[PDB]
Design an enzyme around this catalytic site. Structure first.
Site, PDB file in Angstrom:
ATOM      1  N   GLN A   1     -39.126  35.593 -29.604  1.00 21.48           N
ATOM      2  CA  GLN A   1     -40.510  35.122 -29.655  1.00 21.48           C
ATOM      3  C   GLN A   1     -40.703  34.078 -30.746  1.00 21.48           C
ATOM      4  OE1 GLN A   1     -43.642  34.065 -29.021  1.00 21.48           O
ATOM      5  NE2 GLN A   1     -44.278  36.076 -28.264  1.00 21.48           N
TER       6      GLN A   1
ATOM      7  N   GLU B   1     -38.622  38.814 -22.974  1.00 20.20           N
ATOM      8  CA  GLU B   1     -39.970  38.864 -22.416  1.00 20.20           C
ATOM      9  C   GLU B   1     -40.276  37.557 -21.692  1.00 20.20           C
ATOM     10  OE1 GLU B   1     -39.359  39.277 -25.679  1.00 20.20           O
ATOM     11  OE2 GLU B   1     -40.544  37.896 -26.904  1.00 20.20           O
TER      12      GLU B   1
ATOM     13  N   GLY C   1     -36.156  42.669 -31.744  1.00 21.90           N
ATOM     14  CA  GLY C   1     -35.033  43.163 -30.961  1.00 21.90           C
ATOM     15  C   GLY C   1     -34.273  42.067 -30.240  1.00 21.90           C
ATOM     16  N   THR C   2     -34.993  41.132 -29.615  1.00 26.14           N
ATOM     17  CA  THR C   2     -34.329  40.048 -28.899  1.00 26.14           C
ATOM     18  C   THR C   2     -33.711  39.048 -29.868  1.00 26.14           C
ATOM     19  OG1 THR C   2     -35.825  40.307 -27.016  1.00 26.14           O
ATOM     20  CG2 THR C   2     -34.647  38.223 -27.200  1.00 26.14           C
TER      21      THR C   2
ATOM     22  N   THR D   1     -44.662  42.631 -39.689  1.00 23.97           N
ATOM     23  CA  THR D   1     -45.439  42.965 -38.504  1.00 23.97           C
ATOM     24  C   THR D   1     -44.894  44.148 -37.715  1.00 23.97           C
ATOM     25  OG1 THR D   1     -44.285  41.595 -36.881  1.00 23.97           O
ATOM     26  CG2 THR D   1     -45.818  40.490 -38.367  1.00 23.97           C
TER      27      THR D   1
ATOM     28  N   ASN E   1     -41.722  34.626 -43.930  1.00 27.93           N
ATOM     29  CA  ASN E   1     -43.068  34.272 -43.500  1.00 27.93           C
ATOM     30  C   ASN E   1     -44.088  34.416 -44.621  1.00 27.93           C
ATOM     31  OD1 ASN E   1     -42.870  33.396 -40.764  1.00 27.93           O
ATOM     32  ND2 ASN E   1     -42.445  35.508 -40.153  1.00 27.93           N
TER      33      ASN E   1
ATOM     34  N   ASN F   1     -45.085  27.229 -38.039  1.00 29.69           N
ATOM     35  CA  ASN F   1     -44.028  26.576 -37.277  1.00 29.69           C
ATOM     36  C   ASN F   1     -44.081  25.060 -37.378  1.00 29.69           C
ATOM     37  OD1 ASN F   1     -43.626  29.206 -36.571  1.00 29.69           O
ATOM     38  ND2 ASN F   1     -44.166  28.955 -34.408  1.00 29.69           N
TER      39      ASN F   1
ATOM     40  N   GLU G   1     -21.266  17.320 -43.135  1.00 32.86           N
ATOM     41  CA  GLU G   1     -21.384  17.101 -44.570  1.00 32.86           C
ATOM     42  C   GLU G   1     -22.157  18.206 -45.272  1.00 32.86           C
ATOM     43  OE1 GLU G   1     -22.256  13.349 -46.083  1.00 32.86           O
ATOM     44  OE2 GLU G   1     -21.107  12.219 -44.594  1.00 32.86           O
TER      45      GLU G   1
HETATM   46  N1  LIG Z   1     -42.938  32.033 -38.780  1.00 32.54           N
HETATM   47  C1  LIG Z   1     -43.030  32.572 -37.570  1.00 32.54           C
HETATM   48  N2  LIG Z   1     -42.537  33.839 -37.341  1.00 32.54           N
HETATM   49  C2  LIG Z   1     -42.627  34.396 -36.110  1.00 32.54           C
HETATM   50  C3  LIG Z   1     -43.214  33.698 -35.069  1.00 32.54           C
HETATM   51  N3  LIG Z   1     -43.172  34.478 -33.969  1.00 32.54           N
HETATM   52  C4  LIG Z   1     -42.572  35.645 -34.287  1.00 32.54           C
HETATM   53  N4  LIG Z   1     -42.239  35.612 -35.614  1.00 32.54           N
HETATM   54  C5  LIG Z   1     -41.552  36.672 -36.368  1.00 32.54           C
HETATM   55  O1  LIG Z   1     -41.012  37.613 -35.465  1.00 32.54           O
HETATM   56  C6  LIG Z   1     -41.180  38.923 -35.951  1.00 32.54           C
HETATM   57  C7  LIG Z   1     -41.380  39.886 -34.789  1.00 32.54           C
HETATM   58  O2  LIG Z   1     -40.190  40.002 -34.043  1.00 32.54           O
HETATM   59  P1  LIG Z   1     -39.879  38.996 -32.826  1.00 32.54           P
HETATM   60  O3  LIG Z   1     -38.838  37.973 -33.198  1.00 32.54           O
HETATM   61  O4  LIG Z   1     -41.167  38.337 -32.405  1.00 32.54           O
HETATM   62  O5  LIG Z   1     -39.360  39.950 -31.646  1.00 32.54           O
HETATM   63  P2  LIG Z   1     -39.166  39.341 -30.175  1.00 32.54           P
HETATM   64  O6  LIG Z   1     -38.637  37.933 -30.253  1.00 32.54           O
HETATM   65  O7  LIG Z   1     -40.463  39.420 -29.412  1.00 32.54           O
HETATM   66  O8  LIG Z   1     -38.085  40.316 -29.506  1.00 32.54           O
HETATM   67  P3  LIG Z   1     -38.585  41.730 -28.935  1.00 32.54           P
HETATM   68  O9  LIG Z   1     -39.565  42.350 -29.900  1.00 32.54           O
HETATM   69  O10 LIG Z   1     -37.402  42.640 -28.737  1.00 32.54           O
HETATM   70  O11 LIG Z   1     -39.262  41.481 -27.612  1.00 32.54           O
HETATM   71  C8  LIG Z   1     -42.391  38.879 -36.859  1.00 32.54           C
HETATM   72  O12 LIG Z   1     -42.164  39.659 -38.008  1.00 32.54           O
HETATM   73  C9  LIG Z   1     -42.537  37.426 -37.245  1.00 32.54           C
HETATM   74  O13 LIG Z   1     -42.194  37.269 -38.599  1.00 32.54           O
HETATM   75  C10 LIG Z   1     -43.713  32.425 -35.292  1.00 32.54           C
HETATM   76  O14 LIG Z   1     -44.237  31.799 -34.375  1.00 32.54           O
HETATM   77  N5  LIG Z   1     -43.619  31.863 -36.546  1.00 32.54           N
HETATM   78 MG   LIG Z   2     -40.793  40.041 -27.456  1.00 30.26          MG
END
Ligand SMILES: Nc1nc2c(ncn2[C@@H]2O[C@H](COP(=O)(O)OP(=O)(O)OP(=O)(O)O)[C@@H](O)[C@H]2O)c(=O)[nH]1
Ligand SMILES: [Mg+2]
Ligand SMILES: Nc1nc2c(ncn2[C@@H]2O[C@H](COP(=O)(O)OP(=O)(O)O)[C@@H](O)[C@H]2O)c(=O)[nH]1
Ligand SMILES: [Mg+2]
Lengths: 51, 430, 427, 50
Positions: free
Chosen positions: B11, B62, B135-136, B170, B197, B219, B245
């Site tokens: 995500q 997802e 998780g992903t 989160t 973050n 972002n 480099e």
């Molecule tokens: N800086 C920043 N962090 C993000 C963003 N989106 C998600 N995160 C980080 O992602 C964490 C949550 O886990 P994710 O990487 O979103 O999990 P996922 O990719 O949805 O994978 P699953 O939960 O298994 O479906 C949060 O603690 C955020 O810090 C974003 O747009 N910007």
């Molecule tokens: Mg997800």
């Protein structure tokens, strides 16, 4: 016409070289105007005049 | 040709890549439909006549974020089969993203990498994006990097991983996912650029004066860091810094490949007019401990190797005058066995500004990616939280049932603890 | 009728020599197209020293341009005076050394070496009398260090009796573009002592100082620093290209400035440097060029000549002048302060006069100095290298490319032997 | 609000005084740039009016 791809890549190389030439001439003009600045170029002349 | 492939996992990967390719199409003048109204070969592949496609893959378990790109403002830009979706998410389960539902989607992911590898003439690296708290981002991020090392040997991998913060986070099972994913990215990522973050929350609050920042705002300045990192390949400069480099001038040892990140001018336009942004003024802002994008204190550790990527109208003289004043400053500390710890990169193109972003039009910018020994505090704080997690064995049944063995937490425990031992003795003087 | 073969390596080599061929072609009168527009017949008299005759009256420089990244070659080709070189002399790689001396010397440099010896040997036997090979590169980088010093070693066993002028910039303490620059410099100097006939030691910390305090330049760029070296590289071979009252070839300078075979590193200064604001105040006479010649500020090396005695000096005077008071001024400074000169060499300074001045100047001179003060820049790189090598930092980017730690130990063995000989003659 | 001078021209309202089209006045809030402006105004909690 039968070997259009050879002409296509030759024209691609020519356009690439022309674009690099234009960019380098613009950068050369910019750095020449930057390098022209020295003590002979007018700096602090207002300070000398006000003093 | 200097050509790189960016991989966005999870995500955080899809949302960061939305902001990165918004900056990337705007730098080269690419319209959102893909029409130009050859510096773009680093990221954009010219297909046929007048059409440019991104050299990226958007894979996520997802579907709800992948179809957002498919229905947003960039539907015509991305090739639709490069965007990989799945039936269901891993949902903060490292066991799911790596073992159960990671198998059927990594075969489609490697096929897109295989098709992109033969299209590019000379590949220079992989810019992998993931978040180790999810998780992903962890599980599929771990499994994809395992397959990249076997299939593609000795090619560099640039890892910009979002890492959990000590205070603000989160999800509950982030200490499980971050510790387990540490083993994968330690041995497999050639460069691991940490991201936090909460530090970026603090960067936005005090500099941009944006007191309710959302994920779009974070972002957007991440996108400036990735763009200024790769800006040397795309545009000609005074001192070009290739991707290769960075590894030769930042990592002195193979196991030490974690570097901090900092972007020097984060200035709003109402702050921009009153502030004279000079090279010496922004080099001091780069090495500011509170301006780092990872929540750690660089004063605690010792700097090991530093890289400065300058953009815009930066003459090669005043960057050296800024570096000399940095070396004389006693607050910043250098390790004794690295007397010349600076890599300087000067590019002539000023950074573009997105219409709608909080950043202002600034002539000169610095991207600072440096290695320090203070990043042992980063893994130590999550080592304390994972110690409480595994002691009473909470949330383990979500991992044991979905493929993982019980001792896989144990093997990831001293591995991250040996990283603490490695970082402590290297910075120590002798 | 002698010829100089010019080779440029790396980003620094391709950018210094872009200004070098700009100065020389404007000095002999070749337009950017490639024809002749010289006012005097003496310009066309010696074209062979730097330019090859081509069909249709074209004059093509004897330049072989090489690096491992093609980005720099696009800049030199597309700039002014950039279309005079042969396109086939643009030999280049695609991977890049990446500031790695191991990569530039062993792994990917070696495949490109087979391409450049085909270019050099085709160009060497093209001319009739090889005076020597002139090379310009950088020691701090990896593209011009590793590939450059293998090229020097390979053309040494092919042409051992020809001269070897090397223009090399060295890493600096105050300015540092590269993290791993002590590794690349020490491994390049160790491969330079037994191969290079004579070395022009340059640096970026002295050119920035000269451009700031002497030329009064508020915003000096690399192109401003390249012009100072480019004026020198024409001034060393100035008597080859023109007649004169007392002529000096490359081997005239080599026999005079090299007392012992391993002491072939020299410091360089260019005399008529004045800002445009201060141009009207200066009266151009030989004592005013000489007083700027011997001043330590005008030197283009990090070594301060007040610290160590001058082993042997040189003088490359250009323009109409008097051979009494030119020769008198060289011996007047030998008696004003004889502590800064070595005792067992009477008449340390060698002089030579050329009657053709460069463009825009009526009188000019070039200084070549063999001093034992140049041990300062060798100790300074070595003390940076021995700090890194004890902890074995940044080593896997070298030992992963096929070298042992034994080559680093022998690199410091010759580096500590070079300073040992220079310190001995200082006493 | 200061009182207008006597013999005032009774100035016409702003929209078609400066020449706004019906599409613009209908979709003033629907434009992406206006949406980004509203997002930044939401982000600046109390410093939006500063
Ligand atoms: N800086 C920043 N962090 C993000 C963003 N989106 C998600 N995160 C980080 O992602 C964490 C949550 O886990 P994710 O990487 O979103 O999990 P996922 O990719 O949805 O994978 P699953 O939960 O298994 O479906 C949060 O603690 C955020 O810090 C974003 O747009 N910007
Ligand atoms: Mg997800
Ligand atoms: N004087 C001068 N020095 C240069 C120029 N370009 C690069 N350098 C110096 O070269 C060093 C880096 O060398 P590098 O470009 O990596 O050499 P390469 O690896 O052979 O391409 C820097 O410290 C610069 O100071 C130039 O045009 N003029
Ligand atoms: Mg003679």
């Amino acid at each position: 016409d039968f070997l259009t791809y050879q002409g296509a890549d030759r024209d691609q190389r020519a356009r690439q070289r022309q674009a690099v030439a234009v960019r380098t001439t613009a950068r050369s003009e910019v750095e020449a105007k930057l390098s022209g600045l020295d003590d002979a170029s007018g700096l602090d002349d207002g300070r000398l005049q006000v003093a | 040709m200097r050509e790189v492939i960016s991989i966005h996992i999870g995500q955080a990967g899809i949302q960061v890549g939305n902001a990165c390719w918004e900056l990337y199409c705007l730098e080269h003048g690419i319209q959102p439909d893909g029409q130009m109204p050859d510096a773009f070969n680093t990221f954009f592949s010219e297909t046929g006549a007048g059409k440019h496609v991104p050299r990226c893959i958007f894979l996520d378990l997802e579907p709800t974020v992948v179809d957002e790109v498919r229905t947003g403002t960039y539907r015509q830009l991305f090739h639709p089969e490069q965007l990989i979706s799945g039936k269901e998410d891993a949902a903060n389960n490292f066991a799911r993203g790596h073992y159960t539902i990671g198998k059927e989607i990594v075969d489609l992911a490697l096929d897109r990498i295989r098709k992109l590898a033969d299209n590019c003439t000379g590949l220079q690296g992989f810019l992998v994006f993931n978040a180790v708290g999810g998780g992903t981002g962890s599980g599929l991020g771990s499994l994809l990097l395992e397959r990249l090392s076997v299939d593609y040997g000795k090619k560099s991998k640039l890892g910009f991983t979002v890492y959990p913060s000590p205070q603000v986070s989160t999800a509950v099972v982030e200490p499980y996912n971050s510790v387990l994913s540490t083993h994968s990215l330690l041995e497999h990522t050639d460069v691991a650029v940490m991201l936090d973050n909460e530090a970026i929350y603090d960067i936005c609050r005090r500099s941009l004066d944006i007191e309710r920042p959302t994920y779009t705002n974070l972002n957007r300045l991440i996108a400036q860091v990735i763009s200024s990192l790769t800006a040397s390949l795309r545009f000609d400069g005074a001192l070009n810094v290739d991707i290769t480099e960075f590894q030769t001038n930042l990592v002195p040892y193979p196991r030490i490949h974690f570097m901090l990140s900092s972007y020097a001018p984060i200035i709003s336009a109402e702050k921009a007019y009153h502030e004279q942004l000079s090279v010496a003024e922004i080099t001091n802002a780069a090495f500011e401990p509170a301006s780092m994008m990872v929540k750690c204190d660089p004063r605690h550790g010792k700097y090991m190797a530093c890289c400065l990527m300058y953009r815009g109208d930066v003459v090669p003289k005043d960057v050296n005058a800024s570096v000399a004043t940095i070396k004389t400053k006693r607050t910043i500390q250098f390790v004794d066995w690295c007397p010349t710890g600076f890599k300087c990169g000067i590019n002539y193109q000023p950074p573009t500004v997105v219409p709608g972003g909080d950043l202002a039009k600034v002539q000169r910018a610095v991207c600072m990616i440096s290695n320090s020994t203070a990043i042992g505090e980063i893994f130590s704080r999550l080592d304390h939280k994972f110690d409480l997690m595994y002691a009473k064995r909470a949330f383990v049944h979500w991992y044991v049932g979905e493929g993982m063995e019980e001792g896989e937490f144990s093997e990831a425990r001293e591995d991250l603890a040996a990283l603490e031992k490695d970082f402590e003795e290297v910075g120590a003087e002798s | 009728m002698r010829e100089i073969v010019h080779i440029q390596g790396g980003q620094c080599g391709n950018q210094i020599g872009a200004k070098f061929w700009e100065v020389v072609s404007d000095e002999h009168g070749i337009d950017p197209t490639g024809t002749y527009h010289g006012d005097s017949d003496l310009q066309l008299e010696r074209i062979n020293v730097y330019f090859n005759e081509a069909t249709g009256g074209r004059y093509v420089p004897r330049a072989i341009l090489m690096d491992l990244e093609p980005g720099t070659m696009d800049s030199v080709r597309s700039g002014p005076y950039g279309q005079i070189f042969r396109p086939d002399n643009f030999v280049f790689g695609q991977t890049g050394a990446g500031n790695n001396w191991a990569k530039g010397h062993y792994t990917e440099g070696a495949e490109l070496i087979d391409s450049v010896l085909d270019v050099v040997r085709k160009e060497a036997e093209s001319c009739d009398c090889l005076q020597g090979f002139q090379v310009c590169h950088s020691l701090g980088g990896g593209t011009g260090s590793g590939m450059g010093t293998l090229l020097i070693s390979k053309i040494r066993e092919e042409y051992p009796d020809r001269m070897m002028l090397t223009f090399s910039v060295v890493p600096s303490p105050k300015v540092s573009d590269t993290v791993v620059e002590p590794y690349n410099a020490t491994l390049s100097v160790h491969q330079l002592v037994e191969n290079a006939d004579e070395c022009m030691v340059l640096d970026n910390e002295a050119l920035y100082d000269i451009c700031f305090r002497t030329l009064k330049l508020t915003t000096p760029t690399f192109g401003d620093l390249n012009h100072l070296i480019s004026a020198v590289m024409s001034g060393i071979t100035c008597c080859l290209r023109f007649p004169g009252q007392l002529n000096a070839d490359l081997r005239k300078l080599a026999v005079n400035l090299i007392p012992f075979p391993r002491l072939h590193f020299f410091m360089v200064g260019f005399t008529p440097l004045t800002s445009r604001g201060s141009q009207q105040y200066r009266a151009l006479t030989v004592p005013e060029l000489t007083q700027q010649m011997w001043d330590a500020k005008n030197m283009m090396c990090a070594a301060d000549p007040r610290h160590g005695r001058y082993l042997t000096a040189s003088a490359l005077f250009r323009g109409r002048m008097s051979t009494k008071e030119v020769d008198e001024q060289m011996l007047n400074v030998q008696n004003k302060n004889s502590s800064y000169f070595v005792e067992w060499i009477p008449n340390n300074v060698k002089s030579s006069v050329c009657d053709i001045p460069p463009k825009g100047l009526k009188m000019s001179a070039t200084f070549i100095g063999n001093s034992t003060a140049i041990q300062e820049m060798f100790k300074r790189v070595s003390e940076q290298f021995t700090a890194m090598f004890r902890r074995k930092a940044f080593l896997h980017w070298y030992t992963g490319e096929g070298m042992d730690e034994m080559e680093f130990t022998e690199a410091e063995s010759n580096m500590n032997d070079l300073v040992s000989e220079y310190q001995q003659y200082q006493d | 609000q200061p009182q207008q001078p006597d013999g005032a021209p009774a100035t016409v309202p702003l929209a078609q005084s400066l020449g706004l089209t019906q599409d613009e006045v209908a979709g003033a809030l629907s434009h992406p740039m206006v949406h980004e402006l509203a997002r930044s105004l939401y982000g600046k909690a109390s410093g939006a009016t500063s």
